[PDB]
């Protein structure tokens, strides 16, 4: 049981800690991250994200993000995926980034990647947008025009409410 | 009659629970701290 | 029958109270902030 840095993290320099966790990680960093998440205090929460974005370039396994999202994950997953949307072509990554941006309000950063990225299915995206009502949602009037799906957007707006959406 | 009064009190407690759910739904607004992006 | 429905709502409220008890059990984990030693 050499994994005991969860208590020493509050005193050791995070730089050399990340450097030690990046190297010599022969299927070992996963257990260390699981042990860190087992005692994920608010103080040592961001360090679990800092170490997480070093090994993804070599092996971006889904088990890690699945175990991470099992907790609350207010903005840790969003801050992690903020540097993963670029240099990536997977639609599920973008969908999980949209979910994280819907967990805590950062929707102003989603309307840009909807125009930039074009390697995702807009059907599930607009379904999730219509499901999670932001009560101030206007990325839809952008993605629908980008993918030419305003014929149902106008109907949905007229159904829910029509105050400023079509105007703006 | 007293049990119906207690049911009304339980409905008031459910309204308080709905208020707590609204507070939880508003919590993501406070969760969006700009200092967490550093 | 409506009173039995209210009893089911009370059981849901008890499940919410169990969730609150779990939150209270997790509270000492958040209470252990290492930044309090400064």
From Swiss-Prot, chain A:
It is found in: Cytoplasmic vesicle membrane; Membrane, Coated pit; Melanosome; Cytoplasm, Cytoskeleton, Spindle. Clathrin is the major protein of the polyhedral coat of coated pits and vesicles. Two different adapter protein complexes link the clathrin lattice either to the plasma membrane or to the trans-Golgi network. Acts as a component of the TACC3/ch-TOG/clathrin complex proposed to contribute to stabilization of kinetochore fibers of the mitotic spindle by acting as inter-microtubule bridge. The TACC3/ch-TOG/clathrin complex is required for the maintenance of kinetochore fiber tension. Plays a role in early autophagosome formation. This is Clathrin heavy chain 1. Clathrin triskelions, composed of 3 heavy chains and 3 light chains, are the basic subunits of the clathrin coat. In the presence of light chains, hub assembly is influenced by both the pH and the concentration of calcium. Interacts with HIP1. Interacts with DENND1A, DENND1B and DENND1C. Interacts with OCRL. Interacts with ERBB2. Interacts with FKBP6. Interacts with CKAP5 and TACC3 forming the TACC3/ch-TOG/clathrin complex located at spindle inter-microtubules bridges; the complex implicates clathrin triskelions; TACC3 and CLTC are proposed to form a composite microtubule interaction surface. CHCR repeats lie at residues 52-168. The modification N6-succinyllysine is found at residue 103. The chain holds residues 635 to 802 of 1675 of the full protein. The C-terminal third of the heavy chains forms the hub of the triskelion. This region contains the trimerization domain and the light-chain binding domain involved in the assembly of the clathrin lattice. The N-terminal seven-bladed beta-propeller is formed by WD40-like repeats, and projects inward from the polyhedral outer clathrin coat. It constitutes a major protein-protein interaction node. It comes from Bos taurus. Disulfide bonds: none annotated. Belongs to the clathrin heavy chain family.
């Amino acid at each position: 049981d050499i994994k005991r840095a969860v208590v020493h993290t509050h005193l050791l320099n995070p730089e050399w800690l990340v450097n030690y966790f990046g190297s010599l990680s022969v299927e070992d960093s996963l257990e260390c991250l699981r042990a860190m998440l087992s005692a994920n205090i608010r103080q040592n929460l961001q360090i679990c994200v800092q170490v997480a974005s070093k090994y993804h370039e070599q092996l971006s396994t889904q088990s890690l993000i699945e175990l991470f999202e099992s907790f609350k994950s207010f903005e840790g997953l969003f801050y992690f995926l903020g540097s993963i949307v670029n240099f990536s072509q997977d639609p599920d990554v973008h969908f999980k980034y949209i979910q994280a941006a819907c967990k805590t309000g950062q929707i102003k950063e989603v309307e840009r990647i909807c125009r930039e990225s074009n390697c995702y299915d807009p059907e599930r995206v607009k379904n999730f947008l219509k499901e999670a009502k932001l009560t101030d949602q206007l990325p839809l009037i952008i993605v629908c025009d980008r993918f030419d799906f305003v014929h149902d957007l106008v109907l949905y707006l007229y159904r829910n409410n029509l105050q400023k959406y079509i105007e703006i | 009659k007293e049990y119906l009064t207690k049911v009304d009190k339980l409905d008031a407690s459910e309204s308080l629970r709905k208020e707590e759910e609204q507070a939880t739904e508003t919590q993501p607004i406070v969760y969006g701290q700009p200092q967490l992006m550093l």
